[PDB]
């Protein structure tokens, strides 16, 4: 008897056991194999890492050291893929991307 | 005596301290992150449930999660997520 939770055995930080419990209680299938929460926790951890790193870079080019939802909106809306995933998603207190159409500028 | 709420705010902070050691996060941004992780979880899990139901199978395996990631996520995002899931499953079934 011991240690070694399933996240540490898979080298992750997202909980494999909680994801397995949510997959079991979420009424998705009759059975859940014990590789599906590992894959699922890995995918969620990768997506969280990508969004958090892009938002940290957006905060870093803002002379800031704390991520606000504006930085998350700037991270998501500046990417083709990410915007596509979260294209029908509203972020609270995120604002919009700063853009003006070129015909509105004076000349 | 009221019951406790659970979220991803502890693990998301761990991933943040991996990818950015000297960078904090506000509570509103943590709420955005929790909503994001929940939304992607429901999307992938529902997609994989539909994949298992179409093929007359009764279990969700890592193959169903891989196909759901391929269907849901766009190109290079899906490629790197498949890479991460494959590496984690290979690492998990070795100990």
């Amino acid at each position: 008897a011991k240690a070694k939770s399933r996240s540490s055995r898979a080298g992750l930080q997202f909980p494999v056991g909680r994801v397995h419990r949510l997959l079991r209680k979420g009424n998705y299938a009759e059975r859940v194999g014990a590789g599906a929460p590992v894959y699922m926790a890995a995918v969620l951890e990768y997506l969280t890492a990508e969004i958090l790193e892009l938002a940290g870079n957006a905060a870093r080019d803002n002379k800031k050291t704390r991520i606000i939802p504006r930085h998350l909106q700037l991270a998501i809306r500046n990417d083709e893929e990410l915007n596509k995933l979260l294209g029908k998603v509203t972020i609270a207190q995120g604002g919009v991307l700063p853009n003006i159409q070129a015909v509105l500028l004076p000349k | 005596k009221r019951s406790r709420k659970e979220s991803y705010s502890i693990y998301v902070y761990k991933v943040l301290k991996q990818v950015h050691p000297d960078t904090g996060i506000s509570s509103k941004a943590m709420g955005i992150m929790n909503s994001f992780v929940n939304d992607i979880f429901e999307r992938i899990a529902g997609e994989a449930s539909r994949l298992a139901h179409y093929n007359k199978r009764s279990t969700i395996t890592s193959r169903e999660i891989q196909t759901a990631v391929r269907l849901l996520l766009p190109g290079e995002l899906a490629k790197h997520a498949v890479s991460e899931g494959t590496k984690a499953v290979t690492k998990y079934t070795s100990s």
Partner: single-chain antibody
Framework: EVQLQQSGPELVEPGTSVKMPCKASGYTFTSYTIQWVKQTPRQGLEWIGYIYPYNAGTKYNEKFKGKATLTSDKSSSTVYMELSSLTSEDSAVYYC?????????????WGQGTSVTVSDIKMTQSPSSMHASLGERVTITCKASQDIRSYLSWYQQKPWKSPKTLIYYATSLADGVPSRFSGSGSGQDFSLTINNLESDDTATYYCLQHGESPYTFGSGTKLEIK
């Protein structure tokens, strides 16, 4: 499938400007950044900049700001580079390279390289050149200056040819690369291992970081067979 078409060699007198196109085909053009690097005999490969056609977002090297400008044409699926005020040390091979907006991804596909002829993290590679037989094991070290969280890539370049991507994310194999090449290491210490060689491994090998804002290439290791 993915092609990065370019122009021929441009002989240019000093003082004027020069244009280089990067007509791209085989993929969704707006979803991938186009990055420009230059190569000289004197100092090797160095990263000039990039242009993201999704929002036309540019980012240049600090030593190439003003010297080089980048534009994109979405209708023709082309990326244009302007170099202005060509001095004497501007005769170089200019490469454009596809790279995804994902941080893990690297310069996977390259252009042919336009030869222009005019009338910070330090990369330390310990072996400058080495010789090997037809079946032994080669190890190339790429100790870096600062900390990069596994954001290192390994490239193979034939003479008078575009560089070929071997390793991305410091351990992962590129598309079509066999399992003889193996990347290893993390943090500051990285290495590339060739398991058993062929006659096609006579090439120059480079390591590139993209963890920081200015991307820096390696010094280059020449590998000559028998």
């Amino acid at each position: 499938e993915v092609q990065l078409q370019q122009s021929g060699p441009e002989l240019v007198e000093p003082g004027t400007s020069v244009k280089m196109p990067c007509k791209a085909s085989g993929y969704t053009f707006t979803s991938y950044t186009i990055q420009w690097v230059k190569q000289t005999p004197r100092q090797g490969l160095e990263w000039i900049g990039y242009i993201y056609p999704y929002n036309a977002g540019t980012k240049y090297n600090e030593k190439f700001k003003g010297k080089a400008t980048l534009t994109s044409d979405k209708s023709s699926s082309t990326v244009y580079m302007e170099l202005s005020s060509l001095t004497s040390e501007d005769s170089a091979v200019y490469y454009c390279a596809r790279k995804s907006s994902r941080l893990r991804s690297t310069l996977d596909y390259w252009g042919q390289g336009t030869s222009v002829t005019v009338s910070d993290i330090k990369m330390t590679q310990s072996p400058s050149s080495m010789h090997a037989s037809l079946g032994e094991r080669v190890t190339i070290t790429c100790k870096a200056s600062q900390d990069i969280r596994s954001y290192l890539s390994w490239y193979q370049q034939k003479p008078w040819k575009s560089p070929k991507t071997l390793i991305y994310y410091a351990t992962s194999l590129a598309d079509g690369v066999p399992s003889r090449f193996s990347g290893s290491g993390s943090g500051q210490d990285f290495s590339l291992t060739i398991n058993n060689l062929e006659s096609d491994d006579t090439a120059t090998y480079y390591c590139l970081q993209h963890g920081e804002s200015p991307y820096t290439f390696g010094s280059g290791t020449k590998l000559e067979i028998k």
